[PDB]
Amino acid sequence: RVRSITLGNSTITTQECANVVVGYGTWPTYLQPTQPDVATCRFYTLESVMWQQSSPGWWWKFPDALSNMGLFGQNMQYHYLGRAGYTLHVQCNASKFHQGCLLVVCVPEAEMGCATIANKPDQKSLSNGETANVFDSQNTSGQTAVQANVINAGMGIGVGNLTIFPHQWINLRTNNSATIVMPYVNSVPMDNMFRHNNFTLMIIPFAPLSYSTGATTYVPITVTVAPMCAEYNGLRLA
Amino acid sequence: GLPTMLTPGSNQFLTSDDFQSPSAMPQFDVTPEMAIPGQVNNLMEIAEVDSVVPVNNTEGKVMSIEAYQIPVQSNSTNGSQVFGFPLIPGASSVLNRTLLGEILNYYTHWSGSIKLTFMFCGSAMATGKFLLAYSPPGAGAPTTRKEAMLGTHVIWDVGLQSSCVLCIPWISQGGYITCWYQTNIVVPADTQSDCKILCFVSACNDFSVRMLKDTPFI
Amino acid sequence: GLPTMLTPGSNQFLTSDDFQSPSAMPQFDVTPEMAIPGQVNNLMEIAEV
Amino acid sequence: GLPTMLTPGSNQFLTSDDFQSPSAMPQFDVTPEMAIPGQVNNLMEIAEVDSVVPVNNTEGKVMSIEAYQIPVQSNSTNGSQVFGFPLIPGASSVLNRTLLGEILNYYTHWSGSIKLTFMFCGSAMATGKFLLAYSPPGAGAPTTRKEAMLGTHVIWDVGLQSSCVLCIPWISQGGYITCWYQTNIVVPADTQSDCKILCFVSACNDFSVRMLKDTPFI
Amino acid sequence: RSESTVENFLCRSACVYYTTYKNHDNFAQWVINTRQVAQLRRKLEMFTYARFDLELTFVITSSQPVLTHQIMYVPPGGPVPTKINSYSWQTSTNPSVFWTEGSAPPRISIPFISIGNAYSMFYDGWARFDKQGTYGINTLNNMGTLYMRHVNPIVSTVRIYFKPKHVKTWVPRPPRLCQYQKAGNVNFEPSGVTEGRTEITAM
Amino acid sequence: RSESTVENFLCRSACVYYTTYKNHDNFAQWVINTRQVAQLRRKLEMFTYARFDLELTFVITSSQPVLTHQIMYVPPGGPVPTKINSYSWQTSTNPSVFWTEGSAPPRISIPFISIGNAYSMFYDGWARFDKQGTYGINTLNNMGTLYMRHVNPIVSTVRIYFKPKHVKTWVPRPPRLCQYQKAGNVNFEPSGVTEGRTEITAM
């Protein structure tokens, strides 16, 4: 019924009945000498976020989200060129007296618009590393701010069409988790992990959280990330 | 040289023609392909993906995520209508901006069947029934629960099934979908808010389109 | 290119000619035929009534 | 004659096209080939030939043969740097006029590995060690001998090997080469002058170029 | 489903650029760009990556003996005219066509020319992370530039017709909801998902 | 390595000559020469010997009913015009093309025509040892001459486009460091090997 998964020196627990979404039907694989690194294939658990009846949604940019994360974060600095796939585990802690529904979606090349049309968004507004950015329910206003109104997913599209990207729904009535496997996707086989975010993870409520009186007023959402088949440019003589 | 005649149609540019042309850079060795996940060969591959339908697109809801959230009042009048809409993917405001709706707006004519999925997002311990009824093209729409019940329908008991799926036999370039409160929603506890229903739409079977046109959304 | 000569009759439109011409809509998939009763192949089929 | 149509692109001159054309003198019998030594089929055959690198191209040295002569001070401070440079064949002033550097300046994009040979030209009885270190792209450059020693390197004992060869795994359209005085140069006698090092560069492996352009040197 | 294929959806001619120039700074230019026309841009942006060859046809007219025009293509990284008599007009690595009025319009084909394995429609990154103004610029999408001049007082008008060929695409995206604001970015005015209705029920 | 072959490096069109003439000594001429354009010359001079055929395309325009132009090629050793009406314009061994405005540009092909087995780029010798002014002249490199006239007040302009074909080369040489001074020699101003730097060390 319950499965224990160990990678490196870290262990997490998932359910055996949980479904797995493999984006684009493709599993991550290995690919001017290139050096693989398996020392980083462990689970990195991000600080959880709290889901309130009024939460508009959250997002993370991945190569950046793990930039401070130990050895993975170090390989990004010692090597200049590289690639990796990821497994993303998203779980909610809720009782049978809670209701609500989330869309958990991974979006490739999620270029985002600016609150001011004449400008481009700043680096921090686009990503705060391991700290989640928050979608707005209203229109965003600022000079370098990301236009975060959730209705357009910050991209100028309708939010209900994000289902075109690898995703899973979490309906607290039936499931409290999602697993997404994201293959490396780019126009080039390897890139500079500090100048480009391969994908963005977005968690957007479509059915507001609510609960019976006396129940806990919020639901924790945890995101755990496990890199796969990471590869970097070699650092030695030929 | 070889005797020839020029015919009508010579020395003119048809914007829709297909002729060979010289390469500006014939000596350039073009970068090889690599596999990229997600190759798309046909737009129907997109039309077949479920997207969320903005059923509650009323004034004041259109600008929010709430457009997608059909409210369910747990203590509503028995037999009242929960929701409903004209079933037209290329015209109705409910369906014409969905992934299916967008693709079909590039074609003058199209036909096929569509799939509608209704998902209940109440608490785990919530139970009750809904009547999902379909009115064939030209039949108008039911005015009462009984009228809806005497046509084609499914009774959706949310206590057994969190979702229910309909496939409309006919969708073309109309019919109606309605949902009625057969029962109220019974819960074990007094909650802060109401329950929501999300609706999804996609192409159901082999769907066909015929002539390409400019989208009406620019 | 290949040496050619244009002959008399070049660049003129004969209303009774028969040459190929480019299609304005080559990407359009044309609606298939169905049998329709009463196909006429020749006008003598009418003259004989 | 045969019915034809002229298409777009007819009666125009593309400077990059490839069509047959009539010979002005078709009756002339062209002089036969004879073997001539040195036939060149590809420019990479030139890029692969070692040439001397003007490492000491400082003001006042550029106009002399001295630009190629890296000085070695036999009594220099231990652990000091002898020489070093940015490893960029298509931009660095050290490498962009070498046989490799010149060929690559005719292309917009290129990549491959390069070979660097360092030759010591001191007396037969001179001995001592040098540290040749390589700093991968983006790693900056070592500031001390110890820092260089902890990266990728070779210890070159001139008493055993008059020359040392490095092959850089990556050279593209950066990294650094540095050389440190691990030891002084020990000699049996008091000489009039210092010792020199010559540096040579060539393509190491299959090297690739993609699009031809005007050279920037006219 | 023939009209739904990627090739039939995208392999269609469009007028992408209109310009005028005189025979007395008197030259025209266009950077090849797939974001100039809203209908072309919206169809291409339904994908994240693409490869295609480009067919370019030039409709050239003029008004006040035989006029000859030169159309030059400068590949990414090639020399660029700043003046009508710049040396760059004669570079052998910048292909050009010499055409005279009265014949069929000029047509040239430019192959896929990126050094990446696909052109990208979107880029969640910076050309340089040190400059925030470079967000969204992927230098791998440089398709080259066209320059146009008379060979030797008249006014010429040029219409450039663009047609993608042998088109392959990857990673489909939602169609844009918002109207386009600028060609150099994805900025938008927040917009509602659809048109409204008066009530949630049928009739 | 396709773009690195000798044929792809050298078999490219270049404008090698620009000239004007009037229809009222009123004729143009060009001695075929591969040292007129610095970029063409520098690439060919990376070799010592070469064989190639020549493709010549003529872009001709004019300004103030149907104008006809005559382009004549005089092979090495053939009769040469001194006057617009010289008898040499009618020699049967001097091929010519008659072209009118409005058609595609004239194009002719001249085969390798030296009596040696290759053209030489360099010549460490004298055409005649009795005359020191002949140093560097290899008479085996005579490729012939072009003469241009109107057939019968206007001004014509001619651009000659040159393209080597089926190019074979031998004995590679270092690229020139110095700028070219004259087409008839290899004279140079002594020049440094590269651009300077401030110190021999990295950073």
Numbering used by the authors:
A (entry chain B): 12 to 42, 52 to 258
B (entry chain C), D (entry chain C): 1 to 173, 187 to 231
C (entry chain C): 1 to 49
E (entry chain A), F (entry chain A): 59 to 82, 87 to 126, 137 to 224, 230 to 280
From the paper:
Enteroviruses are nonenveloped positive single-stranded (ss) RNA viruses and are major causative agents of waterborne diseases. Coxsackievirus B5 (CVB5) is a genotype of the Enterovirus genus, which is frequently detected in clinical and wastewater surveillance. Here, we employed a reverse genetic system for CVB5 and assessed how different amino acid substitutions in capsid proteins affects the virus’ sensitivity to free chlorine and heat. To elucidate the mechanism behind reduced heat sensitivity of the CVB5F.cas.genogroupB mutant, we subjected it to analysis by cryoEM.
We applied a combination of 2D and 3D classification steps in cryoSPARC package to separate the particles corresponding to mature virions (F), intermediate-altered state (A), and empty viral capsids (E). These conformational states are commonly resolved in cryoEM analyses of enteroviruses, with A and E corresponding to the expanded viral particles with or without the internal viral components (nonstructural proteins and genetic material). The resulting EM density maps were at 3.6, 2.7, and 2.6 Å global resolution for the capsid-corresponding part of particles F, A, and E, respectively, thus allowing building of atomic models of each state. The two amino acid substitutions causing the largest perturbation in relative heat sensitivity, VP1.D276E, and VP1.T279A, are located at the C-terminus of VP1. These two residues interact with each other and contribute to the external part of the VP1:VP3 interface, both through direct contact and indirectly by stabilization of the local loop region comprising residues VP1.E272-T282. Consistently, this region in VP1 undergoes partial restructuring in intermediate-altered (A) and empty particle (E) states, with alanine at VP1.279 facing toward the hydrophobic pocket in VP3 assembled by residues VP3.P86, VP3.A141 and VP3.Y189. Although the C-terminus of VP1 is flexible in different enterovirus structures, the resulting conformation in A and E particles of CVB5F.cas.genogroupB is distinct from the previously published reconstruction of CVB5-A and E particles having the original VP1.D276/VP1.T279 pairing, supporting that VP1.D276E and VP1.T279A mutations may affect the assembly and local dynamics of the VP1:VP3 interface. Several other areas in particle A and E states of CVB5F.cas.genogroupB also exhibit different conformations and/or greater flexibility compared with corresponding CVB5 structures from the PDB. Most prominent changes were in the N-terminal region of VP1 (VP1.Q49-S60), VP2 (VP2.L42-Q52), and VP3 (I168–V181). Altogether, based on structural analysis of the CVB5F.cas.genogroupB we propose that mutations conferring greater tolerance to thermal inactivation by perturbing local molecular interactions which may lead to improved stability of infectious virions (F) and altered conformations of uncoating intermediates (e.g., particles A and E).
